[PDB]
Each structure stands twice: as structure tokens, then as C-alpha cells.
Design a protein around this nucleic acid. Structure first.
Ligand SMILES: [Mg+2]
Ligand SMILES: [Mg+2]
Ligand SMILES: [Mg+2]
Ligand SMILES: [Mg+2]
Ligand SMILES: [Mg+2]
Ligand SMILES: [Mg+2]
Ligand SMILES: [Mg+2]
Ligand SMILES: [Mg+2]
Ligand SMILES: [Mg+2]
Ligand SMILES: [Mg+2]
Ligand SMILES: [Mg+2]
Ligand SMILES: [Mg+2]
Ligand SMILES: [Mg+2]
Ligand SMILES: [Mg+2]
Ligand SMILES: [Mg+2]
Ligand SMILES: [Mg+2]
Ligand SMILES: [Mg+2]
Ligand SMILES: [Mg+2]
Ligand SMILES: [Mg+2]
Ligand SMILES: [Mg+2]
Ligand SMILES: [Mg+2]
Ligand SMILES: [Mg+2]
Ligand SMILES: [Mg+2]
Ligand SMILES: [Mg+2]
Ligand SMILES: [Mg+2]
Ligand SMILES: [Mg+2]
Ligand SMILES: [Mg+2]
Ligand SMILES: [Mg+2]
Ligand SMILES: [Mg+2]
Ligand SMILES: [Mg+2]
Ligand SMILES: [Mg+2]
Ligand SMILES: [Mg+2]
Ligand SMILES: [Mg+2]
Ligand SMILES: [Mg+2]
Lengths: 121, 252, 233, 52
RNA sequence: GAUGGGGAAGCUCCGUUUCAAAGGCCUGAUUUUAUGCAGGCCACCAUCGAAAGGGAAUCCGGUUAAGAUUCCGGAACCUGG
RNA sequence: GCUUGUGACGGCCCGUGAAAAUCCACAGGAAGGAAUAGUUUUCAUGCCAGGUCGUACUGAUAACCGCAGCAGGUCUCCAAG
RNA sequence: UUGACAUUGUGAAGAGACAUAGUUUCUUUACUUAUUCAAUGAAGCGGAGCUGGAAUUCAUUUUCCACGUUCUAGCAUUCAAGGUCCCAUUCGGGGCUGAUCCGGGUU
């Protein structure tokens, strides 16, 4: 017979079959547990005088929170740990290498109430 | 002593070309099937200043013979060419200012610019403002064509090498005195870092052959051998004569 | 016809985009392709010395076909045929008491380069097949001379793979016969003659003929035409 | 421009928000004439071929 | 400044699209089914490099011992879905 | 009037005074679409979401560099009678 | 920089000796595959053929050129419309031709 017909003068690398990995053994024995559950996320209340005020006056809980956690993780954590509803979460990094979360609850909740249920003042 | 100025140029650290505002390299079309069997038409779309250059460039655009699109080219504009003008490129093109033809298709005496030294090299000879080459004969067997370059030299090249009819625009640029240091400043500011220029005779010996002495002076013949060595070639290199040129130059 | 129209395009330089064509003559092949093709060309442009040039002459596809037909009746044991034979003797011999001679004298094609060479040097081979590929050609180039001096009939044949298939390897470089069934003696005598006529007889003459020296076809043209007009005005 | 309705980015002519109108007058005129002169060009050289 | 490469005894030097088989999008084909092939393109061939260059979009009033075009009040706008 | 913005112009050059991401538009017309009901999210209105790091203060005759709370040095914006 | 040796092969003509058969060595000038330089998203190379015709026929063609684009700052893309053959006529879709043949040396 006769040759192929290429209308391009460029020759490109054949499209070839890529098998997926089917290991003969497992990558690491046991999967790591959740590296960032809620208890590692929100570390401890911040109870400074001026934090307390935000609670009494702004329906805002203030937590020191994991450096490794973002506004999503903080929000979910607070929710799950406190049966509470968060309007929005602001955060800052303290000048001692720790994160503050200003957590505003929705108007259905009373942060003052909800702070001396967790047990502080 | 130390490495002299003309040796430091070669590493081109602070001696590279000032290139940022340049329009791009000026070149003829790639020598394809069109240009080498027939002719192809373009339009000059724009003729435009290129920083650091004297002659303006002409932006010329052609259809792509093999794909639906426009391919733009950067020419050097010959005196007379204009926006909207149709430019014809090819073996079977016709002798008009602006067109580009192989030197074999143009009669003796034709005036051309931006000519190739080999066919397809997209143009090498006579590009500076005002320059041009004259065709002065053909040798149809082994198709060569003899031309005369701006410099005076005659040279024979392939009759397939291409050229563009006419002279490069911007002529007489050098008829006008610069007048001040500052115009040279702005002149070389867009070229390369070669200005101003300390005479070696004003430097110290560490610096230059001409350097030093309790009066300024070169102190040995300033005509240097071809086979002199890097660090030695300052002055009149390989100079076969010297002194005020007396009487008509003109290559015979 | 209908509300349908003829509008023939004009593909003649300076108008209409060129259509899609077969550019296979123009494609920029991968280097390994360009190199293996040029290895061929360069190998013909040179003058190639007689002792390499004597390959390229290969058994014709008729005599060939007949020779694989014969050799194919003498394929060496298969793994199974041998597993079969062993148990057919290992049991039987060891007991009913044959002398490891409850197996019949095997007839096979002999192979392996080193094997065949020793066979040829002992004038045991009756017919030897030499492949024409063999890329270190040295493995094999001495074999026409070898067979010739040992008075052994031989043949340069297309297919190292083809020699391979008759011996159950991928390739085989050489294939030979030393033994034959009487039902075949005659078939072989005939085959050897056609073959001996095409190689061993021709050997001394082939030894004088450099090959290669062949121009490419743009240069042939150039010269078939330059030397057409030059003389014959 | 992505934040703004299509009518802010065109005028309702051929080549609307792209070429300038007097520019499209030119395009049209030149197209018509050149497409006409094409028939004129052909019929002359169809005549040259049969009168030669 | 990596990479196919080329130098260099070597630490490494050269080159940056270079003399390389350099890669991914749009949907169709699935109604064993989850994504294999069927077209056609596009050949652009890393990446780092600006808190004064380019650049989607927020404002006023109030508020602290110390923050604010970032919090509060009000009223907007952009991007993705 | 003063400062700043901006326009329509005018002088100058052998000086003619970046790039890229990104956004839109047009030419094209592959296609996909209605009457027993289709097309339309570049029109309005409506729902959800927008992470990560910086953010205090000094910026100089004392928070910077000059061994220092040094008559030195260190880029800039606002500008009343 | 200059020479020799190696990379280093192939022809042809001419000189050079065993001393007017060609082994060999130099000079000239040919060749291309080594080496070398440019180019290009390796696109139209080389060889033949179709037609047009200049051309003058000393039997009939011995040849040489051509062999789609130039008043105009438009338009030129969907394997191409046309023609023709198929699938079993559905919408869709395919071959050939349109676009001559041969050699895979990108030039
Ligand atoms: Mg309250
Ligand atoms: Mg923050
Ligand atoms: Mg540079
Ligand atoms: Mg300077
Ligand atoms: Mg001076
Ligand atoms: Mg001077
Ligand atoms: Mg001095
Ligand atoms: Mg000195
Ligand atoms: Mg000296
Ligand atoms: Mg001196
Ligand atoms: Mg002096
Ligand atoms: Mg058997
Ligand atoms: Mg409008
Ligand atoms: Mg590097
Ligand atoms: Mg960056
Ligand atoms: Mg920035
Ligand atoms: Mg900025
Ligand atoms: Mg305020
Ligand atoms: Mg506060
Ligand atoms: Mg403050
Ligand atoms: Mg707000
Ligand atoms: Mg609101
Ligand atoms: Mg939206
Ligand atoms: Mg100011
Ligand atoms: Mg200007
Ligand atoms: Mg726009
Ligand atoms: Mg379709
Ligand atoms: Mg909308
Ligand atoms: Mg994301
Ligand atoms: Mg501040
Ligand atoms: Mg202070
Ligand atoms: Mg001080
Ligand atoms: Mg020499
Ligand atoms: Mg090419």
C-alpha cells in the first residue's frame, strides 16, 4: 500500500496511554487523624477587660485561635463547639504570635449569656 | 597596568545597546513560494521613527498564503514610499520604488536598498539613512549580479538575493551640525554608551598606551599592527597611509 | 443546480488561502527518525568494500520461501514437547529400562552463532542461513568466507527475525542444517544447488566488487541531464 | 466595559462600535466598484483571448 | 533563572526557544459507567523580578486609654456561583 | 487671584518619549431555535459566598544611619492673611 | 600568524618513478555523504506530463520559453462551492474529483 497523509509538517509526541497508580503497598500505614479539629482550632477565650466589653456591647465572642486556622474553620468550630450562630468573623495576628478572632454572633444569640455558660467573666 | 576602555567594551556590561523603544528588527519577508515564483502584495500601514535609527521604518502587512490572517512586516522605508501604498514583492514584480525584487530581475543601473548578501538572509546591505546599492552588471551563467555598495566596494552576489527599489529615507541627516554637547548626549542616549570620550593622551599609563608623560603626547607611532594584541590596539589600526587626504578620492 | 452555485476557487499565488495538502515530504521528523534514514543514505553514498558489499545480495523470495518451508519441518523442541518428552522417558527409561533411549534421535535446525561456526569448521553443517541485518555486521561478515573455505554451502537471507521465528527466538542471526530425514534429503540437495549457484559459486567474483557510490535522486537527475546534452547535441 | 450593557458598546450599523461610519461608506463604495471592475476586467481578457 | 542540550577533571559555565517526539481547551461520544474515544482547532514551550509602573470593586457619620476607608450605623459596589 | 485638575491648540528633536496581564468590540455565520407555543440572562428584580499575610507608633536637633537622646545624613503629599 | 600531520572521502584532466603497460604521489576542477553556514510553526524541491505559443519544419517535431494575482488604504477562514460515487435514505456523514504524475533529499 502507501504512506499516511500528514497535512501538518509539525510532528508532535504521540498521545499515549497513562495508567493510574495501583501500588503494591500502602503509602503510610495509617491515615493521620484530623490535624485541625475544633478543639485545636479555637484554643482558649481571650478575657481582657476590653475583650469583655466587646462581649457585653457587641454580641462578640473573642477567642485565641490556632495560627493554622482560617475564617471558615474558626466559624465552623465556634458553631460546633457552642451551638451558636456566627454572623461574621474578623481576625488578627497578635504581637505575640497568636491569633485573635472577633466572632460576631447573629441577633438570635446573646454572647454575654453564651460566655458565662462556657464559664468565664 | 589595567584593562583599557576599548577592551572593556567586549563584556558589554554597561556597553550593550539601548533597545527598549526600538520597533523591532527591520527585515524583508521570509523568501517563500510567493516571493520566489510570483509576486505578493502588501500595504504600507504606517511609516514610523525607530529610536536610535536615522531612517524611518515602514510597517507593511501581507495576507498569509497558508492561513487566514494578516502577517505584518518591518521594512526600512525608501524615500517616496507612503501609507496606503501597495508594495509588491517577488520575482515577477515590477520595477517601482518600494517593491522588492531579486537583483537578477532588475536592469543594470537599478537603484536598490536593504539588499541581501545571500538569498533569504532578509537584508543586509545599504540600510542606513540615505544609502543604496547600484546594480552594475549581471553574469547570467551561475546567476550572479555585481553591485556597488555605499562604501565604494564592488561585490558580486547571487542574482536571487533580493533588494528593495529606491533609496532609504532620511537623507542628509548628517549635513546638520549637532552644535551642542547635549544633542550628542541625546543622540547616544538612544544608541549605546560610547559618549563622551576621554583622549587616552589625557589618561595615566595604567590606563592606556597613550597615557602619561609630563606633556600630553603619544610618544610612539600611533599606527598599530594588525597582529597586535588585545590591549595594544589603540590608534590607527593597520593604517596603510596616514595624514590629510589630498585630492579626489573616488573609487576608480 | 437548484439555488446552488459553482464558485471555483483560485489557488494561484496572491489570492485564496492555499488548501490543505499532503506535506508528508516536509515534516520535521524526530531526530531518531532523521538519523536512521541518514544512516541508510550515508551507507550508500560511500564506496562500500566488497566484503560488506556482498550482503545486500539476498536469496530471492521464491528460493527463500522454499528454504523456510524445509527448515520449518525441523523446528527445535517446544517447552511443552520437552516436558512431554522428559516424562515420556524419565518415567519409562528409569523403569522399563531403556538407556535414555526411549526417545528418538532428534532432527532440528542448529542455531546460535557460536554453535554454527564450530559446526561449519567441522564440516558438519549441510546448509547455513545468514541474516542480512545483523548490525554489528562483524558477527557474521566472516561467514561467507568461512563457509566457502570449509566447502560448506551457504545463503545470505532476509530476516534475522525470520530466522528467529523458525527457532522460537525473536531473532537468530543464523540457522543451519546438519541432519536431515531421508524424506527430505532430496528436497535439500535441490535447494543447496540453486543457493550454491547464487552465492558460493559467485563468491570469488563478488569479492572484487565494491558497492555503494550511489547518488541521491536530485543529483542523478542533475547528471543524467548534464551528461545528456554535453555530448549528444 | 464588562459591567455595562451591550448598547453602550455599539452603534446600530455594519461595523457598529468598531469602524467610524464615514469609514464604512468608503468600504462599501470601494467594495462595490472593485467587485464591478472585476467583471469588467474578465470580459476584456475573455475578448483578448478570442481576438489574437 | 530551571529544563532537551553543548563545555568543563570538577565545584560548575554556556544557552532560554535555543539543533527537543516539549502540551490543554472545548464539547461531543456514555445512558454496561464512569469518563475511554470521536472531530476541530491553539503551538503560546518554564518560573522569579515593582507595597512609586499596569490593576475588578466603598463611602459618609459615630465610636477607643491606645484600632479604624478594617469596628458600629446607614447606604453602595465588584468578582465568582 | 492661589494650588491642583482638564481640554482645544502651539513650540521642540540626528531625543519623537515601556511592556504584559486583563476588559470590550467588530467581521464571520458552525449551529440551536416558535404557534398550541418556543427562544432569550450583555434589561429589571431576587439567593449564596469572597480565604491568606500586613494594619500600633516614630519617620527624625531623641524611635532610622553616623559607637550616643551627635548642630551631620536620609525619598515624598497637603499649605491661610 | 605560518607550516606539517590527523579529521579526509569520490571522479576527471595534467604533471611526477620500477626506468613509453598503471600501483603511487603532488597541481588544477569536478562531485556529496564528513565537516561548515543560513533559513522556516521544515509548504510547494527535483524529474516527467498536460494544455498556449514564439519558433522552422528538409518528414514530423529537432527544440526554447511561458503554463491563474498590478487603476482604488474593500472582502478572501468552517476538510470548498460545483461535479460524481457510496451508507440504504433523516439528520447526519464518508470517498474521488475540483487541486496531473513520479521520487519521500525540508530549502
Ligand atoms: Mg446586649
Ligand atoms: Mg486581617
Ligand atoms: Mg541586549
Ligand atoms: Mg557615558
Ligand atoms: Mg575627548
Ligand atoms: Mg577622540
Ligand atoms: Mg592626568
Ligand atoms: Mg602601558
Ligand atoms: Mg606602545
Ligand atoms: Mg604618553
Ligand atoms: Mg599632544
Ligand atoms: Mg517437531
Ligand atoms: Mg450606542
Ligand atoms: Mg542557566
Ligand atoms: Mg511576579
Ligand atoms: Mg503593584
Ligand atoms: Mg501600583
Ligand atoms: Mg471617622
Ligand atoms: Mg477597641
Ligand atoms: Mg492613631
Ligand atoms: Mg460596614
Ligand atoms: Mg445593608
Ligand atoms: Mg452575578
Ligand atoms: Mg506640586
Ligand atoms: Mg508626538
Ligand atoms: Mg471598547
Ligand atoms: Mg457538522
Ligand atoms: Mg445582568
Ligand atoms: Mg480557591
Ligand atoms: Mg495608622
Ligand atoms: Mg520624635
Ligand atoms: Mg543628629
Ligand atoms: Mg595548507
Ligand atoms: Mg522550509
Amino acid at each position: 500500500k502507501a504512506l499516511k497523509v500528514r497535512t501538518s509538517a509539525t510532528f508532535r509526541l504521540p498521545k499515549t496511554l497513562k495508567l493510574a497508580r495501583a501500588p503494591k503497598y500502602a503509602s503510610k500505614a495509617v491515615p493521620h487523624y484530623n490535624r485541625l479539629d475544633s478543639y485545636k482550632v479555637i484554643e482558649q477565650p481571650i478575657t481582657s477587660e476590653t475583650a469583655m466589653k466587646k462581649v457585653e456591647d457587641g454580641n462578640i465572642l473573642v477567642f485565641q485561635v490556632s495560627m493554622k486556622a482560617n475564617k471558615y474553620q474558626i466559624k465552623k468550630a465556634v458553631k460546633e463547639l457552642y451551638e451558636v450562630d456566627v454572623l461574621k468573623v474578623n481576625t488578627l495576628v497578635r504581637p505575640n504570635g497568636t491569633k485573635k478572632a472577633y466572632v460576631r454572633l447573629t441577633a438570635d444569640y446573646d454572647a454575654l449569656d453564651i460566655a458565662n455558660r462556657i464559664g468565664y467573666i | 597596568g589595567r584593562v583599557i576602555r576599548n577592551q572593556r567594551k567586549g563584556a558589554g556590561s554597561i556597553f550593550t545597546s539601548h533597545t527598549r523603544l526600538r520597533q523591532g528588527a527591520a527585515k524583508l519577508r521570509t523568501l517563500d513560494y510567493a516571493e520566489r515564483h510570483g509576486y505578493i502584495r502588501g500595504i504600507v500601514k504606517q511609516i514610523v521613527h525607530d529610536s536610535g535609527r536615522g531612517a524611518p521604518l515602514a510597517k507593511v502587512v501581507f495576507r498569509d498564503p497558508y492561513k487566514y490572517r494578516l502577517r505584518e512586516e518591518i521594512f526600512i522605508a525608501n524615500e517616496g514610499v507612503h501609507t496606503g501604498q501597495f508594495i509588491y514583492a517577488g520575482k515577477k514584480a515590477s520595477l517601482n520604488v518600494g517593491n522588492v525584487l531579486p537583483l537578477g530581475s532588475v536592469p543594470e543601473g537599478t537603484i536598490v536598498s536593504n539588499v541581501e548578501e545571500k538569498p533569504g538572509d532578509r537584508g543586509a546591505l545599504a540600510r542606513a539613512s540615505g544609502n543604496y546599492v547600484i546594480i552594475i552588471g549581471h553574469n547570467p551563467d551561475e546567476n550572479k549580479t555585481r553591485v556597488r555598495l555605499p562604501s565604494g566596494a564592488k561585490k558580486v552576489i547571487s542574482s536571487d538575493a533580493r533588494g528593495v527599489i529606491g533609496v532609504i529615507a532620511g537623507g542628509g541627516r548628517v549635513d546638520k551640525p549637532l552644535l551642542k554637547a547635549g544633542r550628542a548626549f541625546h543622540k547616544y542616549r538612544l544608541k549605546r554608551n560610547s559618549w563622551p570620550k576621554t583622549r587616552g593622551v589625557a589618561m595615566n599609563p595604567v590606563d592606556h598606551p597613550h597615557g602619561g608623560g609630563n606633556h600630553q603626547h603619544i610618544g610612539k607611532a600611533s599606527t598599530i599592527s594588525r597582529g597586535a594584541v588585545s590591549g595594544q590596539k589603540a590608534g590607527l589600526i593597520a593604517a596603510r597611509r596616514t595624514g590629510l587626504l589630498r585630492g579626489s578620492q573616488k573609487t576608480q | 443546480n437548484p439555488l446552488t452555485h459553482s464558485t471555483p476557487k483560485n489557488f494561484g499565488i496572491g489570492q485564496a488561502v492555499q488548501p490543505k495538502r499532503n506535506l508528508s515530504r516536509y515534516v520535521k521528523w524526530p531526530e531518531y527518525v532523521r538519523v536512521q534514514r541518514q544512516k541508510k543514505i550515508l551507507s550508500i553514498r560511500l564506496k562500500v568494500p566488497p566484503t560488506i558489499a556482498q550482503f545486500q545480495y539476498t536469496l530471492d523470495r521464491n528460493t527463500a520461501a522454499e528454504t523456510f518451508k524445509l527448515f520449518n519441518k525441523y523446528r527445535p523442541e517446544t517447552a511443552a514437547e520437552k516436558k512431554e518428552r522428559l516424562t515420556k522417558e524419565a518415567a519409562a527409561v528409569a523403569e522399563g529400562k531403556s538407556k535414555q533411549d526411549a526417545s528418538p534421535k532428534p532432527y532440528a535446525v542448529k542455531y546460535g552463532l557460536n554453535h554454527v561456526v564450530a559446526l561449519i569448521e567441522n564440516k558438519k553443517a549441510k546448509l547455513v542461513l545468514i541474516a542480512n541485518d545483523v548490525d554489528p555486521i562483524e558477527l557474521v561478515v566472516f561467514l561467507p568466507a568461512l563457509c566457502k573455505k570449509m566447502g560448506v554451502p551457504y545463503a545470505i537471507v532476509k530476516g534475522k527475525a525470520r530466522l528467529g521465528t523458525l527457532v522460537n527466538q525473536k531473532t537468530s542471526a543464523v540457522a543451519a542444517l546438519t541432519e536431515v530425514r531421508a524424506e527430505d534429503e532430496a528436497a535439500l540437495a535441490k535447494l543447496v544447488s540453486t543457493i550454491d549457484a547464487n552465492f558460493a559459486d559467485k563468491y570469488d567474483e563478488v569479492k572484487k566488487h565494491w558497492g555503494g557510490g550511489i547518488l541521491g535522486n536530485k543529483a542523478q537527475a542533475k547528471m543524467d541531464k548534464r551528461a545528456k546534452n554535453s555530448d549528444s547535441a | 466595559y464588562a459591567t455595562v450593557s451591550k448598547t453602550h458598546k455599539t452603534v446600530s450599523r455594519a461595523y457598529g462600535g468598531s469602524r467610524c461610519a464615514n469609514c464604512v461608506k468608503e468600504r462599501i463604495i470601494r467594495a462595490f466598484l472593485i467587485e464591478e471592475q472585476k467583471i469588467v476586467k474578465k470580459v476584456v481578457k475573455e475578448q483578448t483571448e478570442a481576438a489574437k
